[PDB]
Amino acid sequence: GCALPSTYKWTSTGPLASPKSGLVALRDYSHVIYNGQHLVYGSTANTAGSYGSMNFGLFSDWSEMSSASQNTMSTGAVAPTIFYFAPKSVWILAYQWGPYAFSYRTSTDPSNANGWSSPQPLFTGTISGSSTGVIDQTVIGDSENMYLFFAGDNGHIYRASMPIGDFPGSFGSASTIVLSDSTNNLFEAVEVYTVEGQNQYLMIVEAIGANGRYFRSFTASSLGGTWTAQASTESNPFAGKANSGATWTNDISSGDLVRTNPDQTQTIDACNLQFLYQGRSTSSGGDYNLLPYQPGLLTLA
Amino acid sequence: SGCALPSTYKWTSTGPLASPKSGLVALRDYSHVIYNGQHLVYGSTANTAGSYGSMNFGLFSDWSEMSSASQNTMSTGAVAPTIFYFAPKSVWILAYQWGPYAFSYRTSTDPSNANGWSSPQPLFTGTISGSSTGVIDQTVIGDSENMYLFFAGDNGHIYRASMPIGDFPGSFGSASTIVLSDSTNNLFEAVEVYTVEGQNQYLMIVEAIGANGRYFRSFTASSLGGTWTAQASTESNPFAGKANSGATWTNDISSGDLVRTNPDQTQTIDACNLQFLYQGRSTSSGGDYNLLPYQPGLLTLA
Ligand SMILES: OC[C@@H]1NC[C@H](O)[C@H]1O
Ligand SMILES: OC[C@@H]1NC[C@H](O)[C@H]1O
Ligand SMILES: [Ca+2]
Numbered sequence: 001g002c003a004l005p006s007t008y009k010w011t012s013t014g015p016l017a018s019p020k021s022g023l024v025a026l027r028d029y030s031h032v033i034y035n036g037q038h039l040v041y042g043s044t045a046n047t048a049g050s051y052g053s054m055n056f057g058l059f060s061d062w063s064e065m066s067s068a069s070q071n072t073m074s075t076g077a078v079a080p081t082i083f084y085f086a087p088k089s090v091w092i093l094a095y096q097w098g099p100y101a102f103s104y105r106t107s108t109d110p111s112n113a114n115g116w117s118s119p120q121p122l123f124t125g126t127i128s129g130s131s132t133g134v135i136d137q138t139v140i141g142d143s144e145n146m147y148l149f150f151a152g153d154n155g156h157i158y159r160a161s162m163p164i165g166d167f168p169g170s171f172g173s174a175s176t177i178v179l180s181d182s183t184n185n186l187f188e189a190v191e192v193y194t195v196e197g198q199n200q201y202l203m204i205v206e207a208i209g210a211n212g213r214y215f216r217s218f219t220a221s222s223l224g225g226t227w228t229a230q231a232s233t234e235s236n237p238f239a240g241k242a243n244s245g246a247t248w249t250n251d252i253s254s255g256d257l258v259r260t261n262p263d264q265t266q267t268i269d270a271c272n273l274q275f276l277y278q279g280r281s282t283s284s285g286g287d288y289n290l291l292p293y294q295p296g297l298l299t300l301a
Numbered sequence: 302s303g304c305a306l307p308s309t310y311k312w313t314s315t316g317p318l319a320s321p322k323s324g325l326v327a328l329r330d331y332s333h334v335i336y337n338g339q340h341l342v343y344g345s346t347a348n349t350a351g352s353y354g355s356m357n358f359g360l361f362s363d364w365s366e367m368s369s370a371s372q373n374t375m376s377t378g379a380v381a382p383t384i385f386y387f388a389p390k391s392v393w394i395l396a397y398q399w400g401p402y403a404f405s406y407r408t409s410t411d412p413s414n415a416n417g418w419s420s421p422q423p424l425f426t427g428t429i430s431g432s433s434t435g436v437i438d439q440t441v442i443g444d445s446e447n448m449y450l451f452f453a454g455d456n457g458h459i460y461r462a463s464m465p466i467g468d469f470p471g472s473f474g475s476a477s478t479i480v481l482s483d484s485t486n487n488l489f490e491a492v493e494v495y496t497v498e499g500q501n502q503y504l505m506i507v508e509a510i511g512a513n514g515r516y517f518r519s520f521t522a523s524s525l526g527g528t529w530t531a532q533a534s535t536e537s538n539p540f541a542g543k544a545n546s547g548a549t550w551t552n553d554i555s556s557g558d559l560v561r562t563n564p565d566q567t568q569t570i571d572a573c574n575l576q577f578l579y580q581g582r583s584t585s586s587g588g589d590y591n592l593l594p595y596q597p598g599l600l601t602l603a
């Protein structure tokens with residue numbers, strides 16, 4: 001395939017959807033291709049600043065996202081991750097703020113927002129130094145193990161693992177810290193991907209900059225190994241105001257790179273890098289929980 | 302944040318930060334937490350007869366304010382205390398010696414009130430052999446799996462007990478396991494244990510008796526339930542002591558607490574900003590140990 005870029009630059013769409021009546025924001029997207037169409041799950045914020053979740057109706061082209069249905073989940077699955085777990089032929093939805101520190105549900109009908117199984121434990125542990133507690137999971141496998149990565153709004157990235165034959169199931173309560181920095185430099189919204197054909201993994205993490213939210217990147221040769229800084233500063237980031245080509249938003253915030261293969265390896269084609277991110281109008285302000293986040297798409301330049 | 306521990310320690314120091322109120326001769330064995338952005342310090346007292354009790358200080362924002370903070374006597378003593386917030390059950394804990402059990406604890410939702418604590422409960426009900434004092438100087442620390450009790454015996458040993466985190470608050474029982482052994486003077490008392498922020502590592506400090514005064518030695522571990530390895534191991538190159546403190550008002554660097562920013566049961570220290578609230582005494586002081594004029598000072602890494 002293609003090696004990761006040494007230096008990142010992008011072009012952007014404008015906003016691709018707006019929240020339906022009774023909602024103020026669409027956040028934290030997770031995307032898969034399902035039956036040749038785009039299947040997107042995400043969080044919601046309502047007029048009171050309370051968080052829930054949803055999916056979009058299946059849509060073929062990004063220009064059609066604005067007319068897709070917005071389907072409210074009856075029990076919330078905030079900051080979701082969706083993937084197909086191939087060894088047991090089942091789709092997985094992982095999330096925070098449910099009955100366990102992280103939870104999951106299963107389905108064979110993932111286009112139905114309300115077709116998921118009863119919640120099961122994904123992780124039951126704790127962290128310290130945090131105003132939020134554990135936040136923003138992702139889940140990724142290799143041929144031997146499944147891995148859980150997450151954040152804490154506290155400058156740390158955490159990891160747990162289990163044998164692949166034990167999944168779906170709980171990772172337990174123990175974790176290991178894999179990265180540490182200032183709170184603003186490693187804040188939240190971590191994502192991890194297999195770089196197709198390159199024997200390498202990509203991690204991206206949301207940071208708080210002087211000029212907006214932006215992403216930093218790291219690389220590894222194994223999911224249980226060391227993470228090395230790649231695009232590390234606000235002025236030369238993975239994706240941010242400095243290199244996004246987006247003028248409708250300053251923020252490039254919590255979302256998902258575009259994955260074509262929907263399986264548990266979270267594989268990206270680095271010949272065709274694209275980023276489904278949350279942004280907000282440059283004129284927006286006030287209460288964080290009421291900010292009008294909505295989706296946009298970056299394509300490498 | 303996530304700095305590695307230093308390989309080698311050296312410090313600068315304040316002078317005395319506070320002195321005992323009328324009727325007391327010493328303030329000893331501090332335990333500190335941040336409570337709503339302010340410094341909350343508990344400690345032992347020695348009175349004009351050399352008898353031991355406990356107290357807290359009024360809440361204060363800056364170390365320069367400690368000398369004018371109220372000194373609030375506890376109606377029932379909690380000698381050599383440990384204070385922390387037990388997050389899983391949303392409650393503050395005060396652990397201590399010389400009460401109704403070998404080690405005891407009380408609970409509170411109002412920890413700034415010296416006399417607002419619940420009735421005493423058992424923390425530990427065992428004994429140790431070959432000690433002139435019996436069990437002394439507890440601390441309590443958790444990870445994601447278990448809570449741990451560490452303590453000393455004025456006898457060259459450090460002791461450990463443990464329980465599942467879901468069983469706490471409760472008693473650790475009566476059994477203990479010896480994790481370190483040396484001469485009485487090399488591993489004497491005033492043990493403290495901390496999580497090194499971001500490092501997947503733990504730090505233990507222990508008070509020792511040197512030629513030139515009291516000083517601290519250090520150890521590290523990769524798991525709280527595992528083996529402890531010596532780090533700073535001599536009086537001339539200590540964790541903290543006369544050799545490296547930058548303090549001239551005191552020779553002793555004795556029983557206190559590293560500065561913890563997060564108040565919870567993990568006892569986390571930010572190794573980018575190491576500071577030590579220690580007990581010291583005037584260089585011209587002397588005589589009976591129980592009457593010594595111990596009082597607080599603060600080290601900052603140099
Ligand atoms: O949108 C809900 C939370 N907001 C910050 C974090 O990235 C999300 O989990
Ligand atoms: O200050 C009371 C005791 N004195 C020695 C020991 O470190 C303390 O528990
Ligand atoms: Ca996410």
Ligand SMILES: [Ca+2]
Pocket residue numbers: 330331381382438439491492556557
């Ligand atoms: Ca102590």
Ligand SMILES: [Zn+2]
Pocket residue numbers: 129154155156180181302303498499
């Ligand atoms: Zn930190």
Ligand SMILES: [Zn+2]
Pocket residue numbers: 361362363366
């Ligand atoms: Zn003040």
